[PDB]
Design a protein around this ligand. Structure first.
Ligand SMILES: Nc1cc(Nc2cccc(Cl)c2)ncn1
Ligand SMILES: Nc1cc(Nc2cccc(Cl)c2)ncn1
Lengths: 325, 325
């Protein structure tokens, strides 16, 4: 039922976008079908984690507060596809980083996906009192993610910024705002229960869960084999400010830091294996267990503070926290 | 006075954006000063044609309709920098088309410039009744420009689309909406005289002036020498659907079209000179004079229809039409 409606609203959104291009933007069928295929390729196929969270939050707030039900659930599905389209926009921008027409189309497709989030919001929410507030928080978080990518890209240029606090700054703006806080807030807005929740506890929860997932994501990028990860680990070669790097630099000797700096950020197969050897020989994945258990304990506590004033909202956050844990 | 205030509001806008990053987004001084230099490099230096049009329209409507004056003129300057920032966003996206960090920063800088148009609008216009309508028309035109770039990039893939009507479709969405119609509309919105103008005549004027400038721009891209153009002409090598190409294909023989198709879209110095030879030997720049005179006559007529209901607005359009003519 949740996924079956989420895909049904996708058909309704796509039909509006493509018909608007044909009827209002004077687009020929060849380019309409091309944009249909590009939309299905970049937006469909994933796990829809962010989009389904919006639907999960809106369900808990209408059942725990009738034509109002159909309106809120449909609005949540549109907001869910706004984030899914925004993630597709981010994925296209990543493909560009790594008279050529296929690059011109990739750049143009990234801008179209970003614009489609505005068009589907201006259309389905034209008669909603929260349209202006929804677009403001949406674009502010998109601005936050771009600022977060600047911290992540320039984390090794200006090892001075390889600290745990700066790691939290990167995860906060690069991941935590649009992956965890944005879907929760969009669920509160379509349910019109935005002023009925403690946003401080909610924001603090999103940062903790965002940081928890990133530490697990950094370890998998290093030790999980390529076939079991769905990609090829590249944080070592890219000299990324990962949780493993900042935790190593804090508990290593001068030679181990010297050997780390002489091997980190290189593409040689044996210099990367030397980095992994330094990670293994420091019992870092022992610190990984305790660090994650400490964060998970902080997640359980903040959910209870949020339930005293918003019970049904915390139930949907326990579901979101389960999909990460 | 017009430029002196336009640059003064730039300082006010930049100070808000950079302080917000320092105070709210936890940005260090090194990256704040970096974004200051990137902002000044991509946004300043140009002619500010689009931005100054917003100020030109707002002046004519308040004088021809007092703390209301300072509010409208300041709002027009902010809207002017919204388009100037949007143009800087488009210019950065063009540089990308033609672990490398300088490409990561370019892509990120393009997204930041686009987001800064939203942030400066959400801040200075937070208490304005037109904020939601301003953002909607702004993003819809940005979506229009991206659709226009798809028509221009794919104009030679699917010479079937090398027609005069399709040329008008490209110029309409790629150039005419955000270069001529957008600054005029933003001047009407900050002056709150949006429902007091014939938008059909206004839209038709922007398309005619946008198409007029593009034909002149296409000829200069071909015949104006590189030092007198500010760039290097590349429409022939890129196989662009220029006004010269579509006008040539309509009045050429079978061999001349065959020789055109065998030389167009190539980078050879002599194949491009063969294309220019075919353009010269067809008296195309004779058709250029008559075509531009016909468009200019249509511009003079539509201005008079618009003055019968909006006199002061037409005076600012005669000034904008003078900067193209
Ligand atoms: N001078 C320019 C540049 C430009 N760039 C642009 C705009 C929207 C989307 C994409 Cl992919 C590129 N569009 C029109 N005129
Ligand atoms: N998986 C991703 C991708 C991603 N891309 C992105 C977002 C904003 C700006 C820029 Cl330049 C790139 N950001 C976070 N997570």
């Amino acid at each position: 039922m949740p996924m079956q409606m989420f895909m049904q609203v996708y058909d309704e959104i796509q039909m509006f976008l493509l018909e608007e291009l044909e009827l209002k933007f004077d687009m020929d069928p060849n380019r309409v079908r091309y944009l249909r295929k590009m939309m299905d390729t970049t937006c469909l196929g994933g796990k829809y984690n962010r989009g389904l969270t919006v639907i999960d939050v809106a369900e808990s707030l209408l059942s725990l507060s009738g034509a109002r039900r159909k309106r809120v659930l449909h609005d949540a599905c549109v907001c869910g596809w706004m984030i899914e389209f925004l993630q597709a926009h981010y994925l296209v921008e990543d493909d560009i980083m790594d008279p050529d027409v296929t690059v011109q189309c990739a750049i143009n497709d990234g801008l179209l996906l970003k614009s489609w989030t505005h068009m589907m919001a201006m259309h389905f929410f034209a008669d909603r009192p929260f349209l202006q507030d929804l677009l403001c928080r949406f674009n502010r978080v998109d601005y936050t993610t771009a600022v977060g990518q600047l911290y992540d890209v320039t984390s090794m240029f200006d090892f001075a910024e390889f600290t745990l606090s700066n790691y939290k700054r990167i995860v906060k703006y690069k991941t935590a705002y649009y992956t965890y806080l944005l879907p929760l807030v969009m669920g509160l807005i379509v349910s019109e229960a935005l002023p009925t929740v403690d946003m401080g506890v909610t924001e603090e929860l999103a940062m903790l869960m965002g940081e928890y997932f990133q530490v697990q994501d950094d370890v998998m990028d290093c030790f999980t084999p390529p076939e079991r990860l769905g990609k090829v680990g590249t944080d070592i070669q890219d000299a990324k400010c990962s949780w493993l790097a900042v935790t190593f630099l804090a508990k290593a000797s001068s030679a181990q830091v010297a050997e780390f700096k002489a091997n980190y950020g290189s593409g040689d197969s044996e210099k990367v294996a030397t980095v992994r050897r330094l990670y293994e020989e420091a019992d870092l994945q022992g610190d990984y267990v305790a660090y994650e258990a400490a964060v998970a304990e902080q997640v359980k506590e903040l959910i209870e503070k949020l339930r005293l004033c918003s019970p049904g909202f915390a139930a949907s956050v326990e579901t979101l926290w389960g999909k990460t844990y």
